[PDB]
Amino acid sequence: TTPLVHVASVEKGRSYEDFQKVYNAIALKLREDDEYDNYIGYGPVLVRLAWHTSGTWDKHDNTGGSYGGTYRFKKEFNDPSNAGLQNGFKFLEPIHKEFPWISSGDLFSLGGVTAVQEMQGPKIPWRCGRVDTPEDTTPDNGRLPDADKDADYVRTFFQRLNMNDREVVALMGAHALGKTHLKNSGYEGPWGAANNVFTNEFYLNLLNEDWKLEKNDANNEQWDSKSGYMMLPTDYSLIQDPKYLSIVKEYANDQDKFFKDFSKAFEKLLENGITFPKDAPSPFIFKTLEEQGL
Numbered sequence: 001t002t003p004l005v006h007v008a009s010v011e012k013g014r015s016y017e018d019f020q021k022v023y024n025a026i027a028l029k030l031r032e033d034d035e036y037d038n039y040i041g042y043g044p045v046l047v048r049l050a051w052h053t054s055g056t057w058d059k060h061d062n063t064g065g066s067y068g069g070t071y072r073f074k075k076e077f078n079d080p081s082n083a084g085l086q087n088g089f090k091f092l093e094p095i096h097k098e099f100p101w102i103s104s105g106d107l108f109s110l111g112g113v114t115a116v117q118e119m120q121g122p123k124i125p126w127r128c129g130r131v132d133t134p135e136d137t138t139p140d141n142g143r144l145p146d147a148d149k150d151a152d153y154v155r156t157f158f159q160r161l162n163m164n165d166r167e168v169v170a171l172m173g174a175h176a177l178g179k180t181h182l183k184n185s186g187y188e189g190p191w192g193a194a195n196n197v198f199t200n201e202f203y204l205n206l207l208n209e210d211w212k213l214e215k216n217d218a219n220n221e222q223w224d225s226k227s228g229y230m231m232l233p234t235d236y237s238l239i240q241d242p243k244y245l246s247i248v249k250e251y252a253n254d255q256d257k258f259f260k261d262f263s264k265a266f267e268k269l270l271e272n273g274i275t276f277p278k279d280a281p282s283p284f285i286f287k288t289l290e291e292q293g294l
């Protein structure tokens with residue numbers, strides 16, 4: 001039961017160029033399969049997948065985390081908390097088939113990095129080396145957070161992922177992406193207008209929209225605005241708690257600051273639980289398709 005140590009191990013003989021090729025394949029498919037989810041694209045769901053495959057981590061015993069790529073196993077794949085992520089996994093299938101040498105954990109996390117960057121978000125340094133672990137290393141369901149709670153719940157929950165107030169608020173900004181789907185989570189609606197463009201719209205909407213606490217068709221409460229946006233109880237708690245509120249205001253007034261803080265928190269989230277050898281390669285910063293003229 002002793003806390004295991006997960007040492008990053010570079011896929012045999014691979015280097016930056018190999019991973020840039022995987023990034024490009026993911027990016028090109030994001031461009032190709034643009035009809036998904038009423039033309040939102042697979043960007044948002046890939047980010048959620050990267051988060052859910054990483055968010056199972058427990059700093060106390062180093063179980064869960066992005067290292068093992070255990071989402072490929074039935075128990076985790078069927079976690080009610082992961083409902084809807086099968087779409088992201090299916091999207092990545094052809095990618096993994098073309099580059100069978102990349103580990104599942106590296107692919108799931110790289111998918112999130114690729115999506116954020118291609119959607120015009122900040123650059124996210126990414127490190128390779130996650131290694132697939134056995135099915136018995138799959139974490140039990142119930143480690144991912146709930147959305148019907150308050151600020152105190154959020155703050156306490158994220159301490160298990162070693163995230164502080166600023167890290168939590170920055171990470172939640174990803175809700176500028178995609179939307180909630182009633183069938184997947186019991187919540188319905190987008191957080192903003194630019195569902196597939198990474199910006200600080202989440203914070204601006206929290207502060208500027210006129211929110212009303214209503215019940216959706218699943219009989220769950222959520223905050224709605226006449227603009228057609230919604231906020232989860234946990235999202236709204238970010239402006240109810242005074243400490244979170246200060247940070248929300250900061251990001252709503254400084255796009256660059258949000259980008260830099262989100263980049264650090266997201267990489268941290270994707271790297272929790274991994275031990276990188278002193279001579280491991282430095283983090284990779286991939287060029288977007290646009291930057292490559294592709």
Ligand code: FMI
Nearest residue numbers: 044045047048145146147171174178179180181184185234
């Ligand atoms: C770093 C990014 C990130 C973080 C930290 C983070 C944290 C947390 N999220 Fe969030 N998320 C992200 C990114 C991130 N999310 C994205 C991109 C989506 C959109 C998915 C899609 O559109 O398919 C969604 C969608 C989504 C949905 C709707 C799911 C659906 O119906 O399809 C719910 C209910 C929640 C709940 C919660 C919390 C509050 C409870 C688990 C939470 O703590 N999320």
